[PDB]
Write a protein that binds this ligand. Structure first.
Ligand SMILES: [Mg+2]
Ligand SMILES: [Mg+2]
Ligand SMILES: [Mn+2]
Ligand SMILES: [Mn+2]
Ligand SMILES: [Mn+2]
Ligand SMILES: [Mn+2]
Lengths: 221, 216
C-alpha cells in the first residue's frame, strides 16, 4: 500500500529550514486545513520547496466554548510557523464545515481575529457558495476525497511530502514526535472501526488544495 | 563542476538517524580514509544505495608527529560508533605516498586506540611492495581521476549526504563542519586535504574494493 522505504525516508530526512538564507526556492504561501469534529481536531500547515511539499505544522486536539479553543489552537500554530519562516507572506486557510457550516464560520472569523492581532499578513479563506447562493469561508468536503487520498499516497511513495526539523506542534510535541505520531496514522490509510484519522486527513487536504485549480477559491475574509 | 542545488540541498538535508530503529537498510560498516601531510580524515557509511558522512576532521600540526595524527582519527571514530550501535565493522584506508613505512605505524596506532576503547572488527586496506609484503596502507595513483569523477557524478545526483549530528572535534564551534567542507567542494577542477578524504572514503565503499581490506 504505502512503502516501508517511503516511510523510513520521511522519518530520517527532514528539511533544515533554518540552515540557509537562500529562500529563492521555497513557497511564500502557507496553506492550512482543519478537520474539527469523543473525536479530535486535525490541523496541518504546509508550504512548497522546489517541486515538493514541506510540513511546517501539525496539531491534533482533544477536549470554554469548543469553538474558541479550536480557533485558538490553530491560530497559535500559524503565528509560530510564520515566526520561524519570515519568507512566508500569505495564508491560504481552509475550514471543513461539513457537519456544521454554522460553527466553522465563526471559527474562520476567530482565527483571523487572533492571527492579525499577532502579526501583519495577507489572510485568505477557502470560500464556497452557501444555501442562499452566497460565499462563506468554509470547505464542504466530499467527492474530491478519493482523488486527494489516491494523490497523497502516490506523492508520498515517490517522496514529495517531507517534514521540517523545526515543525511546530503545541498539542503533539510534548508527548510524541509529531512525525512518528503522524506515521501511526498514515500506516492506517485505506483507499475507499476505532482509528482517529484527523491529523492525516488534515495533511492530505492541506496538500491537495495548493494547486492552481483551487487558486481562486481562496478570497479575502 | 557542481550544481548550485546539490550544494544548497546538502546544506539543508541531513540524516536524522535516531528516530529510526530499523537499521535494516543501514550500512553496518563504517569506512574511514585519511590523507597525511594539512591532514584530513573522513568517516563515511551507506544508506541503501546512497552515502552518508558520519565524521570529519582537518588537523594541523611539539613532536610525536604520527601519534597526534592517529589519536585524532581514533577519537572521532569511537565517538561515531558510540552514537550508531548498528555499526559493527570498520574499513580504514590510510594514504601513504611520501613515506609508506610511517603510513603503516599510523595504521597500527589507530588499531590500538579503538580496540582499547571498544570491541569491534577492524580491517585496513592492503598493498604489496618490493618484497611481496601485503602491507596495511593504500597508495594513490591513476585512480584519483576516476574516483573524483564518480564523486562529482554522485554528489550532483544527491547521493552524498550528512548526518544531522556528525562528529567533528577538529573543527566544530567557530565553523560549521558542513559549511566548512562545502567551501572546499567549490574549488575542485579535474588547500584540499579534507574533500579528497571524502572523495576517497565514498569511493572505497564499492564492492570491487572489498578484498583489498584485511584484518591487520
Ligand atoms: Mg547554510
Ligand atoms: Mg521512528
Ligand atoms: Mn471531518
Ligand atoms: Mn475527522
Ligand atoms: Mn596526500
Ligand atoms: Mn593532501
Amino acid at each position: 500500500l504505502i512503502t516501508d522505504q517511503s516511510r523510513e525516508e520521511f522519518d530520517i530526512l527532514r528539511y533544515s529550514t533554518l540552515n540557509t538564507n537562500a529562500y529563492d526556492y521555497f513557497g511564500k504561501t502557507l496553506y492550512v486545513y482543519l478537520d474539527p469534529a469523543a473525536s479530535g481536531t486535525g490541523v496541518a500547515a504546509v508550504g512548497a520547496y522546489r517541486h515538493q511539499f514541506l510540513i511546517y505544522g501539525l496539531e491534533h486536539f482533544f477536549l470554554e466554548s469548543s469553538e474558541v479553543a479550536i480557533a485558538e489552537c490553530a491560530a497559535h500554530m500559524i503565528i509560530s510557523v510564520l515566526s520561524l519562516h519570515p519568507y512566508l507572506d500569505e495564508l491560504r486557510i481552509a475550514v471543513e464545515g461539513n457537519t456544521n457550516q454554522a460553527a466553522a464560520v465563526r471559527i474562520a472569523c476567530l482565527i483571523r481575529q487572533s492571527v492579525q492581532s499577532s502579526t501583519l499578513i495577507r489572510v485568505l479563506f477557502y470560500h464556497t457558495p452557501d444555501q442562499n447562493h452566497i460565499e462563506q469561508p468554509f470547505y464542504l468536503m466530499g467527492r474530491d476525497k478519493a482523488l486527494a487520498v489516491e494523490q497523497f499516497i502516490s506523492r508520498f511513495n515517490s517522496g514529495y511530502i517531507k517534514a521540517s526539523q523545526e515543525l511546530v506542534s503545541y498539542t503533539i510535541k510534548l508527548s510524541h514526535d509529531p512525525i512518528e505520531y503522524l506515521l501511526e496514522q498514515i500506516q492506517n490509510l485505506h483507499r475507499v472501526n476505532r482509528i482517529s484519522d484527523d491529523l492525516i486527513i488534515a495533511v492530505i487536504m492541506a496538500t491537495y488544495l495548493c494547486d492552481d485549480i483551487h487558486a481562486i477559491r481562496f478570497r479575502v475574509s
